[PDB]
């Protein structure tokens, strides 16, 4: 067991593999599919290559009662090496829609397998979100400074992708959309700007009702969020500084280059005005002769 954790990069294969696995067990309709999740671990970024289904039963009146075939997994791992001998156990995926409080007990059982603290990778099977439709958590046990005992609790790790040469080209090979959520032409990036601005608007709004809910829905004082909230205020911009004036002087600069680049285009288009007219001049004679 390593605590070596910072990030989670996710193969596109995992997301998709887990989406089908959910519907082919047919534990769906508010019934969970839980499988093993395979990849590299013992490094800061946890690198998730593959996933398999596990036979699983979910009591839906009580999510605190489930079936897990422990034997099977040992059987499966031998097969994982055939595929790739860097695949080892690193956790188990959950099928969303989000984190639950029945997940800690399931996490327990998954400590007899992993050499790293069992990963919980929430693969949303509905595709909600404003980034990748994945959240990542890992269970870490830590004292709480409020006065209560040692809990095991899920801290989020960011979600990310990285991919192999074969996988990445396969992605484009399947796909055929030119994509307004990545860069491209001018119009394509204009779509990204408006979204990013609205993305700040959506997320800042979420903090306003979270501060209110601690004192008007009686959520607890969570020190870990609010310390980060304070460092936003320290790094926040100001006004009337010579720093903020230098910005204006740099606005002048770059727009002037654009001004001259635009004017440069216009020279070129006025020559094509003139060339077509040379094309017009010839066509006059031919018209007279016929």
């Amino acid at each position: 067991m390593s605590l070596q954790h910072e990030k989670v990069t996710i193969a596109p294969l995992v997301l998709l593999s887990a989406l089908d696995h959910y519907e082919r067990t047919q534990t769906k309709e508010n019934k969970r599919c839980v499988g093993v999740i395979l990849g590299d671990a013992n490094s800061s970024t946890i690198r998730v290559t593959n996933s398999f289904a596990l036979p699983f039963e979910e009591d839906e009146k009580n999510s605190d009662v489930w079936f897990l075939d422990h034997n099977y997994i040992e059987n499966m791992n031998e097969m994982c090496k055939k595929i790739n001998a860097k695949e080892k156990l690193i956790g188990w995926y959950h099928s969303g829609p989000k984190l639950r409080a029945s997940d800690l007990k399931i996490n327990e059982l998954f400590k007899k397998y992993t050499q790293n603290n069992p990963l919980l990778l929430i693969v949303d099977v509905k595709q909600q979100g404003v980034g990748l439709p994945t959240d990542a958590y890992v269970a870490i046990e830590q004292v709480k400074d409020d006065g209560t005992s040692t809990e095991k609790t899920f801290l989020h790790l960011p979600c990310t992708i990285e991919a192999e040469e074969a996988e990445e080209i396969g992605v484009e090979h399947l796909l055929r959309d030119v994509r307004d959520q990545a860069a491209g032409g001018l119009s394509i990036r204009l779509t990204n700007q408006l979204k990013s601005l609205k993305g700040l608007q959506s997320k800042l709004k979420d903090v306003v009702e979270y501060l209110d809910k601690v004192i008007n829905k009686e959520l607890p004082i969570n020190h870990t969020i609010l310390g980060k909230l304070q460092d936003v205020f320290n790094l926040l911009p100001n006004l009337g500084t010579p720093d903020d004036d230098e910005i204006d002087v740099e606005n002048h600069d770059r727009i002037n280059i654009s001004n001259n680049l635009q004017k440069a285009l216009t020279v070129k288009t006025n020559d094509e005005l003139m060339v077509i007219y040379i094309s017009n001049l010839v066509r006059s004679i031919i018209a007279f002769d016929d």
């Binding site: 001018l186 119009s187 606005n251 654009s258």
Partner: protein, 89 residues
Amino acid sequence: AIRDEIAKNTELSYDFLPLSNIKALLFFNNEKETEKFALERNWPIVNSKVYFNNQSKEKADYEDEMMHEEDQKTNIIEKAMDYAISIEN
């Protein structure tokens, strides 16, 4: 009319005039008469000295108030938005 024109000019021209000096520019022979025009022309003479900087503020404020105002100032954002749609049109 000559009085009004001068009263348009004096805002930029000075910031302080003593009351004997205001009288001189506005072609008054009576110091009382100067004080009487100031009420009507909205000049604040306080302790026998005028404050053109205040008057300037009020008139500027009125000009900011009216709808002209996005492209009167011309926003940093607004400039680039113009450029953007032209190249794609």
